[PDB]
């Protein structure tokens, strides 16, 4: 027998997730790629990104703790 | 690991990518900048906060990534108490900024091993008052050693439940009711499992993780990564979507914020994994009270699911995902109801086309597959 009965609890919501429940990261390491500007400038990638809105985008990773902001750099 | 600098330019690329994509940016600050007496040195963060203010950038903040492994990474040990004080200091900086209401998340600890649970507990005692959400991380496998069988093993999927229970035990003991987020998560660490983390086979772990996260009280799940070098990326090096991107998009179109519960009447209750939410009300095909069921079949045969009273005779839309051949579960291409999912062009996502079933038919779920089912006119009061 490959038939399976489901039981549903539908009385009340057991939890409420954020509308952004399914969110994404960009690893901090990607900012050390010389092509950072070209990659994130890609119209094709922005279309895919828009598809997942609403979402958080976390810019973070091991490299979070080895990145220093330098306002002089170009 | 070496110190690297980044420019105002890099900050603008990142902010613009998020802003123009409708995403909310969370920026992790460097927690290893330390004073003589091993307090956090906030002076570099200060320069970034100033610059972001001056550009009107609406940005959320984190401080540090996996502080539990700082000793391993940088031969510096910061305890949870100190890290809490460091977060208190960042909170005071944010309150004095132009975005005084900016959100602060942390501490982005790894999964709750004894030493990580201790760090999280002391961090929440000290710094818990100033964070808007508790972030922690989870991986099922080591990308180097992960096997195809591991990706399909319900005993591997099940370990995530104990991780979640252990995090909530620490949070309920220190800051009851604080929101709990997965701040970094995927199939496998070390950049993913070669030829596995970028395939149809990655989808069992991703959809199970979403299901269980929602069911167990996790409010947000952050997928490592949207795009990047790791083969757990949703989008490859050519900006082409992989099966997990299509799975993620379909989850967003169908699955609502209100979490319910499904279970299988059998005692086995393994390999057949079921989740139930209210349908996403923003979906124009569906209406208040509709349900979205999603199911994973890790059996090597088709299973037939029967909906309970009073949903037995309802019109159901199927959204079944299966790999495009010839590489089976190791495929990087997916079909929805037998239609290959492909961009229309660089600016155009395809429609995601339902397959209506005959009312009162059993829900067919092939071996090694996953599907969404929307139950139309379910008229569930809790969903309205
Ligand atoms: C298939 O998997 C078997 C164990 O699973 C059980 O048997 C199959 C036929 C399904 O009914 C499933 O629901 C059961 O839980 C293995 O022992 C077997 O060698 C595998 N392959 C086959 C039979 O094709
Ligand atoms: C979580 C960390 O915070 C991530 O930075 C880390 O990934 C990064 C980037 C990835 O491309 C690389 O393969 C790995 C390991 O060198 O570091 C995550 C991971 O995949 O291990 C995880 O530790
Ligand atoms: C990074 O910078 C800090 C101070 O700017 C310094 O103390 C530390 O040695 C550097 N870390 C590494 C791993 O080189
Ligand atoms: C923090 O770092 C800056 C520059 O890296 C340094 O000049 C400053 O004296 C440090 N502040 C403290 C309080 O140690
Ligand atoms: C920043 O972003 C979020 C929406 O994602 C919003 O709730 C908040 O009001 C914004 N804050 C400001 C000050 O613009
Ligand atoms: C944590 O570290 C701080 C800073 O080094 C130290 O002063 C404090 O006593 C430590 N806390 C515990 C509980 O050991
Ligand atoms: Cl600690
Ligand atoms: Cl990357």
- Residues of the binding site of B for heparan sulfate group: 1-3, 111-121, 137, 144, 189-191, 230-232
Q: Where are the beta strands (DSSP E) in B215-351?
A: 220-223, 255-259, 261-264, 272-279, 291-297, 303-306, 316-323, 334-336, 339-340
From B174, B177, B200, B176, select the one nearest B187 (Cα to Cα).
B200
Cross-strand partners of B139 = B186
Torsion angle of the four alpha carbons B89, B94, B96, B98, in this order, in degrees rounded to the nearest 10: 170
The set of protein residues with a Cβ atom below 6 angstroms from ligand 3 is B 1-3, 33, 74
Q: Which residue range is the domain that position A56 belongs to?
A: 1-74
B chain contacts of residue A36, beta-carbon cutoff 8 Å: 10, 13
Known binding-site residues of A for heparan sulfate group equal 27-29, 62
How far is CA B49 from each of CA B53, B57, B96, B103, rounded to the nearest angstrom?
Answer: 6, 10, 10, 13
CA of B138 to the centre of ligand 7 (A): 19
Q: Tell me, yes or no, if B290 comes closer than 8 A to chain A by beta carbon.
A: no
Nearest Cα of chain A lies from the Cα of B356 at a distance, in angstroms, of 20
Q: Are B24 and B69 in contact (CB under 8 A)?
A: no
Number of domains forming the structure of chain A: 1
Tokens of B169: 């035990």
Pocket probe for ligand 6: among B82, B86, B89, B120, the residue whose CB has the most ligand atoms within 8 Å is B82
Experimental method: X-ray
CB B244 within 8 Å of CB A52: no
* CA–CA separation, B127 and B131 (whole Å): 7
Does the CA dihedral B151-B156-B159-B163 come out positive or negative?
A: negative
| Cα B80 to ligand 1 centre (Å) | 48
Q: Give the closest of A16, A25, A28 to B257, CB-based.
A: A16
Structure token pair of residue B366: 């092939």
Question: What are residue B60's DSSP bridge partners?
Answer: B26
Place of tokens 């001056």: B54
**Which candidate in B6, B213, B258 is best for mutational testing of the A interface (most A CBs within 10 A)?**
B6
- CA-wise closest residue to B337 among B359, B350, B321: B321
B93 CA → ligand 5 middle, Å: 18
β B4-6/A67-69 pair status? parallel
Separation between Cα atoms, residue B120 and residue B88, nearest integer Å: 15
Torsion sign (Cα): B225, B231, B234, B240: positive
Angstrom distance (rounded) from CA A64 to CA B157: 29
Resolution value (Å, 1 decimal): 1.7
Q: What radius of gyration do chain B's Cα atoms show? A: 22
**How far is Cα B238 from Cα A29, in angstroms, rounded to an integer?**
18
Most B CBs within 10 A among A52, A58, A59, A74, hence the mutation to make, goes to A58
Task: Give the H/E segment covering residue B297.
Answer: strand B291-297
- Residue A63's nearest CA partner among B381, B311, B4 is B4
Task: Report which protein residue has its CA nearest ligand 4's atom 1.
Answer: B41
Which of B271, B268, B375 has the alpha carbon at shortest distance from A8? B375
Q: Give the whole-angstrom CA distance, residue B357 versus residue B376.
A: 11
Helix or strand or coil: residue A69?
A: strand
Centre of ligand 8 to C-alpha B226, Å, is: 9
Whether B43 lines ligand 4, by a CB cut-off of 6 Å, is yes
Specify whether the backbone of A61 is left (phi greater than 0), alpha (psi in -120 to 50) or beta: left
The bridge status of strand B104-109 relative to strand B133-142 is parallel
Residues near B120 by beta carbon (within 8 Å), at least 6 away in sequence: B80, B107, B109, B112, B134, B136, B167, B170
Measured CA to CA, the distance from residue B187 to residue B232 in angstroms comes to: 7
What are the tokens at B128?
Answer: 């818990």
Show the DSSP H helices in B96-153 as ranges.
114-127, 148-152
Nearest to B164 by CA among B176, B150, B180: B180
Q: Do A58 and B28 touch (CB under 8 A)?
A: yes
CA distances from B311 to B60, B163, B289, B380 (A): 42, 34, 12, 10
For residue B239, what are the contacts with CB-CB under 8 A and spacing of at least 6?
Answer: A42, A44, A45, A48, B227
- Residue found under tokens 């660490």: B189
Closest CA to B58 of A42, A31, A57, A18: A57
What are the distances in angstroms from CA A18 to CA B101, B109, B170, B176, B381? Answer: 19, 21, 22, 18, 20
Of B108, B227, B252, the CB nearest to A26: B227
Considering CB atoms only, which of A16, A44, A71 is closest to B8? A71
Nearest-Å Rg of the Cα atoms of chain A is: 20
State whether residue B248 sits within 8 Å of chain A by CB: yes
Which residue stretches of chain A are H helix?
36-40, 43-51
User: Hey, what are A17's tokens?
Assistant: 């997730």
How distant, in Å, are the alpha carbons of B186, B226, B365 from that of B201?
13, 17, 16
Three-state secondary structure of B121-137: HHHHHHHHHHCCEEEEE
In Å, how far are B78, B161, B191, B197, B231 from B146, measured between CA atoms? Answer: 31, 20, 12, 10, 13
Residues of B with a known catalytic role: 66, 184
Whether the Cβ atoms of residue B219 and residue A25 lie closer than 8 Å to each other: no
Q: Round to whole Å and give the CA distance between B332 and B110.
A: 29
Find tokens 């890609």 and name the residue.
A42
Inter-chain residue contact B64 with A65, CB threshold 8 Å = yes
Half-sphere exposure of B55 (CA within 13 A, CB side): 16
Are the C-beta atoms of residues B141 and B150 closer than 8 Å to each other? yes
Sign of the dihedral through C-alpha B165, B170, B172, B173: positive
Measured distance CA(B94)–CA(B103) in Å, rounded? 9
* Torsion on CA atoms B153, B159, B164, B170, rounded to nearest 10: -170
Q: Do A8 and B31 touch (CB under 8 A)?
A: no
């Amino acid at each position: 027998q490959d038939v399976v009965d489901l039981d549903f609890f539908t009385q009340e919501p057991l939890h409420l997730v954020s509308p952004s429940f399914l969110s994404v990261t960009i690893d901090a390491n990607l900012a050390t790629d010389p092509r950072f500007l070209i990659l994130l400038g890609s119209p094709k990638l922005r279309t895919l990104a828009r598809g997942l809105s609403p979402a958080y985008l976390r810019f973070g990773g091991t490299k979070t703790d080895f990145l220093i902001f330098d306002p002089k750099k170009e | 690991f070496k110190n690297s600098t980044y420019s105002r330019s890099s900050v603008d690329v990142l902010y613009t990518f998020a802003n123009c994509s409708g995403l909310d940016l969370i920026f992790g600050l460097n927690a290893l900048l330390r004073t003589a007496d091993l307090q956090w040195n906030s002076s570099n963060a200060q320069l970034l906060l100033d610059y972001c203010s001056s550009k009107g950038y609406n940005i959320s903040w984190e401080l540090g990534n996996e502080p539990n492994s700082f000793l391993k990474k940088a031969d510096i040990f910061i305890n949870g108490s100190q890290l809490g004080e460091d977060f208190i200091q960042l909170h005071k900086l944010l309150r004095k900024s132009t975005f005084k209401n900016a959100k602060l998340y942390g501490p982005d600890v790894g999964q709750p091993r004894r030493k990580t649970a201790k760090m999280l507990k002391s961090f929440l005692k000290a710094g818990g008052e100033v964070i808007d959400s508790v972030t922690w991380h989870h991986y099922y496998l080591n990308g180097r050693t992960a096997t195809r069988e591991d990706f399909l093993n319900p005993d591997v999927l099940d370990i995530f439940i104990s991780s979640v229970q252990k995090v909530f035990q620490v949070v309920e003991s220190t800051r009851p009711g604080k929101k709990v987020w997965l701040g970094e998560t995927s199939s496998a660490y070390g950049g993913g499992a070669p030829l596995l983390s970028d395939t149809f086979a990655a989808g069992f772990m991703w959809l199970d993780k979403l299901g269980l996260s929602a069911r167990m009280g996790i409010e947000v799940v952050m997928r490592q990564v949207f795009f990047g070098a790791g083969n757990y990326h949703l989008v490859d090096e050519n900006f082409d979507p992989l099966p997990d991107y299509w799975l993620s998009l379909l989850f967003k179109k169908l699955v609502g914020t209100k979490v319910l519960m499904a279970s299988v009447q059998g005692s086995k209750r393994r390999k057949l994994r079921v989740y139930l939410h209210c349908t996403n009300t923003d979906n124009p095909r569906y209406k208040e009270g509709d349900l979205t069921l999603y199911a994973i079949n890790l059996h090597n045969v088709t299973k037939y699911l029967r909906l309970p009273y009073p949903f037995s005779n309802k019109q159901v839309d199927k959204y079944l995902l299966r790999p495009l051949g010839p590489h089976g579960l190791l495929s990087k291409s997916v079909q929805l109801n037998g239609l290959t999912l492909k961009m229309v062009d660089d600016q155009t996502l395809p429609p995601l086309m339902e397959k209506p079933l005959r009312p009162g038919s059993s829900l067919g779920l092939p071996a090694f597959s996953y599907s969404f089912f929307v139950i139309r006119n379910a008229k569930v009061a809790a969903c309205i």
